[PDB]
Amino acid sequence: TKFYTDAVEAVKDIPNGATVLVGGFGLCGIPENLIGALLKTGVKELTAVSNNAGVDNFGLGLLLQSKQIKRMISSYVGENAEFERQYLAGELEVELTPQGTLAERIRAGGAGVPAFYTSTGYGTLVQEGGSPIKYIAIASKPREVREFNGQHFILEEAIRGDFALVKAWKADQAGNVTFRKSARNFNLPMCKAAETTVVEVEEIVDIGSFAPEDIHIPKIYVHRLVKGEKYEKRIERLSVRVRERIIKRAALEFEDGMYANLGIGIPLLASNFISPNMTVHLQSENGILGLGPYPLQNEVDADLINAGKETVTVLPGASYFSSDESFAMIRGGHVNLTMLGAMQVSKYGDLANWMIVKGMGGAMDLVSSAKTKVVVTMEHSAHKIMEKCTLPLTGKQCVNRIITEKAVFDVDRKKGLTLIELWEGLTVDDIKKSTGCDFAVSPKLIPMQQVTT
Amino acid sequence: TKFYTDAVEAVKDIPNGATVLVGGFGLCGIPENLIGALLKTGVKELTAVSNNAGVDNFGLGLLLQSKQIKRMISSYVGENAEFERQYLAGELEVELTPQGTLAERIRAGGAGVPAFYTSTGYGTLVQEGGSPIKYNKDGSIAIASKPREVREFNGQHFILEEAIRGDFALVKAWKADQAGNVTFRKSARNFNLPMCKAAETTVVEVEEIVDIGSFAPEDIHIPKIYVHRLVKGEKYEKRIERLSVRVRERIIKRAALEFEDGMYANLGIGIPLLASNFISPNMTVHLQSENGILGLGPYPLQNEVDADLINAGKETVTVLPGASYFSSDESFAMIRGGHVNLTMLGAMQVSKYGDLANWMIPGKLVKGMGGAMDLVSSAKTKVVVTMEHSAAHKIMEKCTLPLTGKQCVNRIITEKAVFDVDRKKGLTLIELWEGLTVDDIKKSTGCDFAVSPKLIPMQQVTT
Amino acid sequence: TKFYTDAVEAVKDIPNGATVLVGGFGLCGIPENLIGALLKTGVKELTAVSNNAGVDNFGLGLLLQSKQIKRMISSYVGENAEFERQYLAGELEVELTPQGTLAERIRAGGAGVPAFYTSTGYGTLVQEGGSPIKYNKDGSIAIASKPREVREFNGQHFILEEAIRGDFALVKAWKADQAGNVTFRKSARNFNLPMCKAAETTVVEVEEIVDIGSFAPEDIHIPKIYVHRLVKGEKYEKRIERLSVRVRERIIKRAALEFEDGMYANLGIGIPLLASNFISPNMTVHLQSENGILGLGPYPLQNEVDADLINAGKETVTVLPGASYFSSDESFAMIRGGHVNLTMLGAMQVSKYGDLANWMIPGKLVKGMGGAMDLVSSAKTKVVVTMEHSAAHKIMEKCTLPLTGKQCVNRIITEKAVFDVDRKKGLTLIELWEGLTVDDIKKSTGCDFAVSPKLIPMQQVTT
Amino acid sequence: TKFYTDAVEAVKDIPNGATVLVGGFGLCGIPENLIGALLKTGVKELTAVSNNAGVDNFGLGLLLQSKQIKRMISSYVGENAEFERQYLAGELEVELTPQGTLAERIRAGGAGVPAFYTSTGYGTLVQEGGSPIKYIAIASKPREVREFNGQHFILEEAIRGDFALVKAWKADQAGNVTFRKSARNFNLPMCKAAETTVVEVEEIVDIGSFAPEDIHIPKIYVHRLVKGEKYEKRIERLSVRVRERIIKRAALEFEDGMYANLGIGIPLLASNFISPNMTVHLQSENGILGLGPYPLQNEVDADLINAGKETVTVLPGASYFSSDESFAMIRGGHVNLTMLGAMQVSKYGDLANWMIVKGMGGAMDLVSSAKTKVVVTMEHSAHKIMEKCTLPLTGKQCVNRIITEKAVFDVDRKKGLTLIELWEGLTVDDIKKSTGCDFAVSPKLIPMQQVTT
Ligand SMILES: [Hg+2]
Ligand SMILES: [Hg+2]
Ligand SMILES: [Hg+2]
Ligand SMILES: [Hg+2]
Ligand SMILES: [Hg+2]
Ligand SMILES: [Hg+2]
Ligand SMILES: [Hg+2]
Ligand SMILES: [Hg+2]
Ligand SMILES: [K+]
Ligand SMILES: [K+]
Ligand SMILES: [K+]
Ligand SMILES: [K+]
């Protein structure tokens, strides 16, 4: 590991057109000094592999503002207007990649795996191809489909970069590195997938400061190391400590000892109604197990945010891990319940909830496992529940239950919808008229429940 | 995470014929109490996914001794006589799987990846099929492994390997907090960590249970989500397999010059490891141990001996300041990815274009390839072979023993010569021992070779 | 084989929304009686797999006029105004499919092949998706074609195409014996033969029914096993679309020198075909017609005019002694396989490295690629482009119009110059018109180019 | 087309190690003069792509005898002892390839198709790989599997040769060529799959002798043409015009207007009991539709043989076509009934009937379609009907009915076996004891029928 005192010297040889991996989730764990150095060198036509686009004037945004990026390989690109502008204008190329797929492709890129199969994106424009990468001048190409154990998977190829720009917490004098809280995300796997990895840290410590069992990134993967000069500790979303109907029914999906992942909005609100006698472990795809409530203004930590990029806290016994690890945890079905909002759901369980053009985030990986119960919360109606979806799919035959303010439906990939709960006041015919496809009625149809909390 | 006070209660429902993942590298990090429990329940016909076979009367060996295993999916199975006996007798089925492939298939089994491509095993019986899973009393092969599909990426060949998932995982860990979070001690981690994510029911036995909060959240090795059943092991024998306390010399002394300051190297047992003793103290060399260590140090003083710290040869060792420990999948991701600069090992035969044969002899050596096939699997890693020159030619046109890798050896160091190997142009003699002439080498080698225009006497380290 | 005396009874059970394969090339070999029957039954929302759209009031046109078609899977759809109208209006759906790909997908649909790889369409909207299937009244594209998977073999790119199977096949044939064996006359064969094997229910209409035994068994074009329903057509109009009876001249006269004795060539409409008129009678050139003819002769005298014999441009033609006729799949197997030595055609733009753009203009030319994409799909076939030099540059760095093929043009002949094209080194000027200098060409061309050290004046055939 | 008067001049430039396509089915339509010329030139280390191995001293046999072949790509190699000897001895390499796959791979080789999918061999050692190609020193590699429309197919690659040695009937002076009766087989597609095709014919005729609609191989595919000097018109099998129980029940599988393909032995015998008031069209995979009975000694024609290589005749209205065409006809399910003998059949319909090492012939293609009813005839028992087969599979879940001398079972891929007919004298328990897996009993169980003819 070579130590540098100046950031620019550390990245001065990145070439025009190079593929650069840039760590960070939102504004959490971004290599702000190395990004600042790239502004100075002026290197351009970069293919930036980065989970998000930062914001308008920070993180990758600064580099979009300077016209230094030709293409981005990202999973979520919202909250960046200049980004959206260049993209919808044919000025910038963008490969929207499922978040889990992105993380796994990077890990494969450093693990000697040229390609692997994943369920994520099967049945959507990721597999099918055809999304614009550039204005159309370039479209995404399809992904091969192959079946295993009676299920469809698509082939994804490893992503390797010429350089990796990584933000980390500490480095000992030998080049060993660790990451703080949720600032880890993509920084860790990105560290092993480029020919030259450049790491910027907040502090350099003595060799011996780390228990050897606890080194997040061993020195072997750290080629260049610099102590970042300035850390703005920017926080994107400061969050300090009919719809109610959906929320109160979604609250009953929780079961003691359950591992759940809650999407932004109604599902996360639901968690506020969890009985304190019930223990629910909330997973955050950016790498956290054990989300707690929003912080008191003074507990606010820029290294701890949820997937919605909001400042949060964690409960006792929580853990942090990398983005590849997080989606291995999700893809592998270890999370018991995935609950999220949705635009349309199909009679057999297709979900449409990421495009009408910010990207799918981790949505496609969250509904990719059959071992994980997927529950959708959404306002009932224009029909949002039909025969076939009309909006781009997030997954196929992947939703198990729908909760609207009118009804609760269990979803089955073959037999369709079954109404199991009905709101007091409505009759089966009201639901019929408000739904765009037939459905069975449970012989045990009850009034829609509401949590008592 | 459900806590149990009795091991038997924790594994009593494993069914006959179940596929059980058993952690451990050698006798390091084995779940000896859960293994003891399986002796009690008597469950049988098990497909045991275990890196090694333990030893004759410990670890998986106890379960081979009780006839509780039908098949093993392992990478190295030496040092277990009863094991060998059942195998050569058609009593036990065995899938010799490259160590890195084993680790990666298990991780895939927990990561939702049904299959992936790896270089490891390309061009050998792993890809070709023909590896013996079950022998006839002595009529050769009764069940042979099936071939692996081949496909090319970026001008290189890779083979398709499928995920391995178990019904149960028997994992040894160091500590668990009251919430079920788990950590591993030193090199005892190895396969315990990925196995923890690849079975429907993971059962973890630990040496100590601590308060929630005893772990910094950043440093939990296995989050509670992967831990379904937890028990505090009742007895820990802390057994040590190999107690190692602190012509050939020619090879050793020339191999010593392969080291370069700041180099990451992986040294196989024997000559390559001895070479490391001649490293100048003014040179910093980082030694990687495939069982999950970066920074091997010298052998321990008898009182520094730790059962949780062993090298890939299963010998007690130490680590240098700044060392790290990580899991088996992580270790082979590091090796398959080419992050290690130099792989140095012994070999039985090497081919004119670089094929290596160093893990199986007809029906005389059948302990498995270990991590050898992964170590020579990357083009980004320089592979150097150390071996006595002849026998009978060990350097020929084509190998005759099962290959470890194809066109993967870059240099050969014998006590007579040093050859650089090129996948297309063949061998080039670059060093020659004082006293021999090019013709002596010619006569001792089984295929033509160029002679460097800068042919020097064979160097020897001065240390 | 069931015989019917009435066409309507033979197709009365076709269901609304059915996928129906309709044979014919232009107005050659169309099942006009079965089409007439479909008018009577009124069946609708049909997906019509038909090479062409017939003309305004004949062939598939009658069925577009009656609104009986929802979608068409065709390769060339020009000369049908009502067709164009429904299409540009969002009334009719259309999958423009390369002709050779259409033929091959149909054959696969009857041969038990669900999918195969072909070169045709690689690098264009066929592979990329983006081809318009359905237009908005005028808001561009309402439904765009989906991309085709790409995969490499032997260092070349190919795309995956799936079989096409129909519920019904409406086939025009020449004769049927009493057993149901069928034959086709001259070039009227085209798609009728493979379509006969790709539908659950094939319905064949013939001009004559003959005794069993009238065919030598070696010469039955479609064996009775593929013929489920047979009817003798009641009326045959024998309609002829194009009656053809027996600066630019510069291009023509230089293109004439591309012919070499014993050469197999395919000449596109216009300049390339005219060039063939200057072939020395001492030279034997075999002209291939993608609609299934080998050995085209000159245009017929008015009384030699035969509705069953037309060239790919749909013009009445003749054949020379020793000619052969074969099906559309066979024809494109011959072309995709590179058996034709020279493909010569007109073009709108060609790129520095050989990309060709010659089948679509923004939203001004949308009749389809015909067999153009298959003709330039093989590396074994020399592709020569004939075109006026400028417009506005027709030879640039990159094309701006939809591509027909990538790096597939080998030579360009304009009235000013002749350039040989190389996929890597670009353009090389090899011939120059008397009067112009290298700088004149430079100024008229949109990208650099080498100059042959053997640059000659542009040749002209003496005939 | 270049005409030669001497065979040797026509093949003198074939190089050592070249891949040569050699036409012929058995001894029918073999290029005996060109093969004789190869003996003279002595060219060696050839990869011979040939459907069969000829016999011991004729056809490809002559070239195996001279040690001029290094490898063969064939579908059936029986009736050639020297062949078997070199193979079992590690002297000769052999890729056993399903006949239909062979024909299609050759056609793809001339049609610009590098690869395609076929059902044939799915679930057997063709897909799985591992068969010895050479002694083990070389094993067959697996074939990729991919699903389409809910069915599995394997990927097969095109076969192209450096040269094709083709036997044909006539050539006009322009190089157009035709084939006689069943002597066509592989000669026709082989003609389009090599860089240099050499054709030997029995007669050269005037241009104009062929109707242009009837040219089997257009001149474009014929690069070199020679009139063969000597034609021995050799006939391999001269066939001139408990078990009876199976035969008499198999005879009832025929239905008027049916297209059937009958394997050697019991199925073909069954055809002798076809009522003359019923019209049954028999397909022969070597390229014939309309097989008739065995010929009178004087009707014997070496160009007309059945798949069993026996001299036969054809009925009025018969047709001849090429090997690729024949298997397109079979793979595509146009044949209604495939009836054959078998060693073992599985509870769910797996068939094992080609290896215990002569090759699978067309067997794997005949049971490859779901549109074709597959009926197996075999002696009942050691159990030949079990849970799983123990011998190499011909197809998976592909047998629909089994006829033994004891019982008749209908086979279903999911529910298993159902006894529908029972021989007079036996009881359900007799069958139970003679069968290696459970089975349902039809509620309409009848005594086993017997044709009355
Ligand atoms: Hg399956
Ligand atoms: Hg509605
Ligand atoms: Hg290779
Ligand atoms: Hg020797
Ligand atoms: Hg390319
Ligand atoms: Hg210009
Ligand atoms: Hg499916
Ligand atoms: Hg039995
Ligand atoms: K699910
Ligand atoms: K290497
Ligand atoms: K070309
Ligand atoms: K069937």
From Swiss-Prot, chains A, D:
Modified residues (N6-succinyllysine): 141, 358, 388
Record organism: Sus scrofa
Cellular component terms (Gene Ontology): mitochondrion
PROSITE patterns (UniProt xref): COA_TRANSF_1, COA_TRANSF_2
Protein's job: Key enzyme for ketone body catabolism. Catalyzes the first, rate-limiting step of ketone body utilization in extrahepatic tissues, by transferring coenzyme A (CoA) from a donor thiolester species (succinyl-CoA) to an acceptor carboxylate (acetoacetate), and produces acetoacetyl-CoA. Acetoacetyl-CoA is further metabolized by acetoacetyl-CoA thiolase into two acetyl-CoA molecules which enter the citric acid cycle for energy production.
InterPro entries membership: 3-oxoacid_CoA-transf_A (IPR012792), 3-oxoacid_CoA-transf_B (IPR012791), 3-oxoacid_CoA-transferase (IPR014388), CoA_trans_fam_I (IPR004165), CoA_transf_AS (IPR004164), CoA_transf_BS (IPR004163), NagB/RpiA_transferase-like (IPR037171)
Effect noted on mutating residue 28 to A: Decreases KM for acetoacetyl-CoA 3-fold. No effect on KM for acetoacetate, succinyl-CoA and succinate
Protein name according to UniProt: Succinyl-CoA:3-ketoacid coenzyme A transferase 1, mitochondrial
EC number: 2.8.3.5
Record's catalysed reaction(s): a 3-oxo acid + succinyl-CoA = a 3-oxoacyl-CoA + succinate; acetoacetate + succinyl-CoA = acetoacetyl-CoA + succinate
